[PDB]
Design a protein around this ligand. Structure first.
Ligand SMILES: CCCCCCCCCCCC[N+](C)(C)[O-]
Lengths: 220, 183, 84, 73, 183, 183, 183, 73
């Protein structure tokens, strides 16, 4: 009675991989599927050892290990489109390593992932990342401000946004985050009430708002 | 077999069954007539079934509508009760109309009850509306919010596009394959 | 006009209902107490005159706690119609 | 002048209605208790006063009458 | 066979059948008379049938009309109630007239109830109207909106073309072939 | 044979039969007297008949008239109620008059119920009228709208040609040949 | 076996079982019908079960809703009571609507009850709202607070984003494996 | 002025109650004696007068009114 026979009728929903640790690994695509699988093991329908895994869990676990042994490494994300050969994206500018050091890193990652045969390390450009973010916000016609720091970029999107804007912003941010993660570029979205509706005012270098006749407000 | 719940309504029981099947728990529905429905599961699945029943706070409540608080069996109704019943009927008739639009599966609507004061000697306040709706997969949500706003705006004497909030979402993946039976 | 017509009908109607229940209930009591003389003289309603006398005050008090609310609602309604 | 007088009588009409209701009900209850000979004025008058103070009729009248002419916010 | 629902009435049952057949689920309707109709399906389809019943929130509600909040049985009723009944009857008569135009399969109408105020000491606001309708396939919707607006404008004392919202949609594809029976 | 509907009225059954025959579905009507009429079809046609029943929302309602909301058999009447009955009868008498014109098959009329305010303290508003009608094939619609407008204009104290809306349509193709019987 | 609790209801029993299972205590639920449910455990686990029953203050006393203090079914009502029932119905209808959003497992909502002043003569005061909600694991909480605020803002005549508090949390780890039986 | 009037009615309300009670007692006694065809007012007005004077109602009333506004000492 193989494990694949126990997961259901839809076969291609899951992928079973043997590991050097003498344990079966079940690769899932999302939380719902993850729990659909975990139930089988927790019920005890299978007699040998098995484990369930997914991309978000593995990214978190590996980042927690990196925090301890490489506390200054600049990197983006690990992609598991092909689970036998993950791809690890590192910053070209912020890192400084030799080829030997990169190889050592590769081998230690391979020891953390007993289901993978090798890990490919690829160097990506930060300017590219930041540019794709800004281009996407322009494409969506959102209002924004950009702030630059030594190791990160922050985009502030705040005001009296409309429903359409909220929806399109949410969709875009969700798309970008899945590609680049949240380490280098951050988006801050904030709603605030419109002070200016229905009031006459001067705008320019010397703006002010007439709160009413006889009352001047000078923000600065 | 262990008893989870008894004396359920038809529309509670079907919701529990749906939620357990989603998590790969095979369940059974039994009818006792005047005693209602009973739900049962196997022992290996009992723990999980308990955890999910708690986490979703099942069985579900009856659904609440403002007109229940002001039953028309009255010797006298104040202005306040009549106006409340009125608005609580409009809310329901709007939801029932939105479900007829193309591709909408379900929706909910809310109106700002000014009726919590009579406007007694006071100028009237404008109306605000909120709506939630669920769409079929592959729908251009951005392009469909416009239709809803346009439709709601003219349903009332004075409404501004600024005062209408609309939130849309897509249906989740379909649960077609049956759960596995414990070995 | 239609406001004057409404408030007048509502008055006649309120009189009919608020005077209904007390006289029906008193009829039922007076009937059953007249009938069960057919078994026993049933002194314990009407013999203790002090208790019959208290009963009236009790009834009037309780009843006012059910009708004053109604009249207050009606009063507010008519004043609203008169001035607004 | 004439239109004002008319509109005043109209108001007075509405003010009378609840007290008429009281005056009838109280008589019918006294008849239900058989005390046919007692004059009901002796009991109806205090009820009317209670009703008027609980309704706070003076405040309502004084406010609404002004509201018919002024505009206050 | 597993029981999905009991005690339905005729118009609830026919809707449940229509929805399940659309998704390739063969279902059976049984009549018990005073006990109503029952719906049954095969085991291989039980899971799917449950999931769809949840997704569409079946069985459907009874249809709501504002005249149900203000029963004409009442012996005396305020001018507000009467005005509400009046409007709630005009709405229905309009829907029934639109359903006679060429190509319309069904429709809905909504009117702005200014009775949310008595309009005491104040001028009455202008009327606003909203309408939904479904057309036969191959209809020039753009050219047909004009007729509807023209027809609605004159049903009230004061209406502007700006205050009339109209939303149209086409009928979905016809379900003519029967679903397959489980092997 | 499978049961579609039970307890219909005569005028509901004939409408259903008409709609099914138009789509090539052979149906049978059975009479149970106090239990009403029943409609049945063959299994090969069951699916289609269900889908059409849902698409048209059969069986049809009764027909609403505003006079039904203010019955003459009632113990009280406000002036508003009397005025409503009056208008509701004028409408029906116009509908019955147009059908005697040459070529008109059927018609419907709507009047502006200005009575939804008293017209107290204010000058009354002008009347507005709307009419729908259906003509036999080969009729000059353009040349026939003039007659209708002329006729309607003088039925009220103050009406302008600008305030009269008229919509005309032709009869669809005749359904003369019988549907084919399932093999 | 030692008796922990007797005469429980169905929801209290399932709550206790859930809490005990989380701490690895195997418990049994027994039904006595008119006498309710009873919970029992083994002696080696009695001490622990006692300590947790105290620490969580079990069994849970039932849910409070403000309409329970001013029960609608009465001979009499007063403006304060009516206004209270109204607000206590809007609260419940909003919570029931939020639980339909994508990912939300449960939520709770609170409204500022200004009715503790009559708001007669005294001018009425602006509304404040608070909400709690629990999400499925892997949800961008930061990006989801905006939607909630947007939805709530338009449910009332006058609300500022500054006056709306929202607190979100994720679901805890799932309890799927059964506890071990004492040796 | 509009608040003073309302206070006056509030006070007088509570003074009416005991006299009402006395009227009910008299009527019930005449019925229990069957001495039906006598109007009770003729009997109860002497009783109300003698009772209130014998208790100096006017004195207590005057003190109770002034003590809202002064201390007599
Ligand atoms: C003998 C009892 C008399 C009670 C009179 C109550 C006032 C009725 C005023 C007329 C009300 C009916 N209305 C307005 C249609 O005339």
């Amino acid at each position: 009675a193989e494990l694949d026979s126990l997961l259901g009728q839809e076969k291609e929903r899951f992928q079973v991989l043997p590991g050097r640790d003498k344990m079966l690994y079940v690769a899932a695509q999302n939380e719902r599927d993850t729990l659909w699988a975990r139930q089988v093991l927790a019920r005890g329908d299978y007699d040998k050892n098995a484990r369930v895994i997914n991309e978000n869990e593995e990214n978190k676990r590996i980042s927690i290990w990196l925090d301890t042994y490489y506390p200054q490494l600049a990197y983006y994300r690990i992609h598991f489109d092909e689970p036998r050969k993950p791809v690890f994206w590192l910053s070209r500018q912020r890192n400084t390593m030799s080829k030997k050091e990169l190889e050592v890193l590769s081998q230690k990652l391979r020891a953390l992932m007993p289901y993978a045969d090798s890990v490919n390390i690829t160097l990506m450009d930060d300017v590219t990342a930041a540019g794709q973010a800004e281009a996407g916000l322009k494409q969506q016609a959102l209002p924004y401000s950009r702030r630059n720091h030594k190791g990160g970029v922050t985009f502030v999107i705040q005001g009296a946004l409309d429903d359409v804007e909220i929806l399109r912003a949410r969709q875009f941010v969700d798309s970008y985050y899945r590609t680049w993660g949240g380490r280098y570029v951050q988006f801050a979205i904030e709603l605030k009430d419109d002070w200016l509706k229905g009031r006459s005012f001067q705008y320019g270098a010397e703006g002010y708002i007439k709160m009413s006749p006889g009352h001047w407000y000078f923000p600065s | 077999d262990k008893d989870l719940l008894k004396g359920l309504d038809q529309e509670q029981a079907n919701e529990v069954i749906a939620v357990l099947q989603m998590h790969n728990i095979e369940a059974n529905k039994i009818d006792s007539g005047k005693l209602g429905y009973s739900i049962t599961v196997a022992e290996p699945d009992f723990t999980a079934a308990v955890y999910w029943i708690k986490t979703y706070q099942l069985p579900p409540r009856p659904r609440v509508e403002i007109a229940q608080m002001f039953p028309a069996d009255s010797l006298v109704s104040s202005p306040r009760a009549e106006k409340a019943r009125l608005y609580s009927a409009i809310e329901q008739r709007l939801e029932q109309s939105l479900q007829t639009m193309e591709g909408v599966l379900s929706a909910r609507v809310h109106i700002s009850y000014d009726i919590d004061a009579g406007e007694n000697g006071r100028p009237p306040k404008p109306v605000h509306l909120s709506a939630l709706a669920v769409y079929e997969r592959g729908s251009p949500l951005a392009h469909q919010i416009s239709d809803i706003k346009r439709f709601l705006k003219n349903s009332f004497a004075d409404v501004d596009y600024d005062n209408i909030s609309v939130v849309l979402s897509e249906r989740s993946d379909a649960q077609l394959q049956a759960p596995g039976t414990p070995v | 006009m239609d406001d004057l017509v409404f408030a007048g009908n509502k008055a006649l109607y309120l009189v009919l209902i608020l005077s209904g229940w007390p006289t029906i209930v008193a009829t039922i009591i007076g009937l059953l107490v007249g009938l069960f003389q057919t078994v026993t003289q049933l002194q314990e309603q009407t013999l203790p005159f002090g208790i019959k006398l208290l009963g009236v005050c009790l009834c009037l008090f309780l009843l006012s706690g059910w009708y004053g609310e109604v009249l207050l609602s009606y009063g507010r309604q008519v004043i609203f119609l008169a001035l607004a | 002048a004439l239109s004002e007088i008319k509109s005043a009588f109209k108001i007075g009409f509405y003010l009378y209605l609840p007290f008429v209701v009281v005056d009838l009900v109280v008589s019918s209850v006294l008849l239900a208790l058989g005390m046919m000979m007692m004059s009901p004025v002796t009991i109806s008058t205090p009820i009317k006063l209670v009703l008027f103070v609980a309704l706070d009729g003076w405040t309502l009248l004084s406010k609404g009458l002004i509201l018919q002419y002024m505009d206050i916010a």
